[PDB]
């Protein structure tokens, strides 16, 4: 996901160390830039449909269950990258380090915090992040709310 990404049925948000797609309404991510409607019950009628971010209803007597996509693990009812399983970040979230060829969880922080080298790089140091978002609509601009940047009305 980059500043040039268009999130399908969602919108880009920016944290201190990454961008990601946030889904509109109650849709869920089927990949990093695509949101689709979510089924409430996994069964025969809803098989293969999305049931959560990076998880879909699959067939496994016969039964159906919500399972994370390859590379993700169910942790506290949420699919997160495998390498983020044991990571705690404080004022932010764990993401995979794009600079490291070896998949490794690192912290990306709520706007106004940055990784704190005095606190094992958790999101506990005050520091600024320049907004990078390209807000295409002439009436919109990058705005900070609730620890993220997103495009919103001027």
């Amino acid at each position, epitope marked *: 996901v980059t500043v040039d990404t268009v999130c399908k049925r969602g919108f880009l948000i920016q*944290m201190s160390g990454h961008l990601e797609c946030k889904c509109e309404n*109650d849709l869920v991510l089927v990949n990093e830039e695509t949101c689709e409607e979510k089924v409430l019950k996994c069964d025969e009628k809803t098989v293969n449909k999305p049931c959560g971010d990076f998880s879909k209803c699959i067939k496994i007597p016969v039964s159906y269950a919500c399972k994370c996509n390859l590379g993700y693990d169910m942790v*506290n*009812n*949420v699919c997160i990258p495998n390498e983020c399983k044991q990571v705690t970040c404080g004022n932010g979230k764990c993401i995979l380090d794009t600079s490291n060829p070896v998949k490794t969880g690192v912290c990306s922080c*709520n706007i*106004g915090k940055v990784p704190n080298v005095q606190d094992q790089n958790k999101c506990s140091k005050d520091g600024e992040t320049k907004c990078s978002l390209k807000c295409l609509k002439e009436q919109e601009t990058c705005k900070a709310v*609730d*620890g993220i940047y997103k495009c919103d009305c001027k």
Partner: antibody
Amino acid sequence: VQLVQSGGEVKKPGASVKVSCKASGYTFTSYGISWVRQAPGQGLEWMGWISAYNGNRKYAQKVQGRVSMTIDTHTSTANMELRSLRSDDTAVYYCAKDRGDGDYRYYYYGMDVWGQGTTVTVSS
Amino acid sequence: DVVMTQSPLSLPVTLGQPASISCRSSQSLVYSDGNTYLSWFQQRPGQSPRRLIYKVSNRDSGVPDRFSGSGSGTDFTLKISRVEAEDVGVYYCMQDTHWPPTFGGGTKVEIKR
């Protein structure tokens, strides 16, 4: 990071009261403000919420017809006006920093900072 | 409205001993995004509430390690591993999974004698 509330008030039944809450040490307009009251001896009760980011507001059913919440972005201040007061509005009223986007959840969890409280006494 | 029920109402503790407070909700606190929006607050005598825990088990900055939170679904626990004198006060849980946010009725930690 702090929220500084206005001083205590004494009011007659049927009057109104305006309590203010001034933010400093964080970006006020990136967040919102919830109001919570606590009657003497009793537990905490949520009254409502207003976004300093976009002005959306939501009121608890117990007060929804007689409360008004407003933002002054120039002074980083949230106000709560409670109208047609009655004796059972006697309480300490707290403001607390909360979400600015009431429609989406990100990675910020609200009620992380509280003001010092404002005592309101309603009595004839 | 979600009802939050805490127990016990009054909790006498011995300084240095563990203690634990229970919070039960009248419905599941797991939200449609998979997260559980359950928090714990400490209110020392004469002061404002202070958040200790958010999202069930995450400790706020500046909160001592002896506080921890656990649980899932409708059943939650705040544990103090070794009570210190400064921990006397009233503790509240709060859900904001379902609107309106609602608080438990509170648990008063006092000195046992």
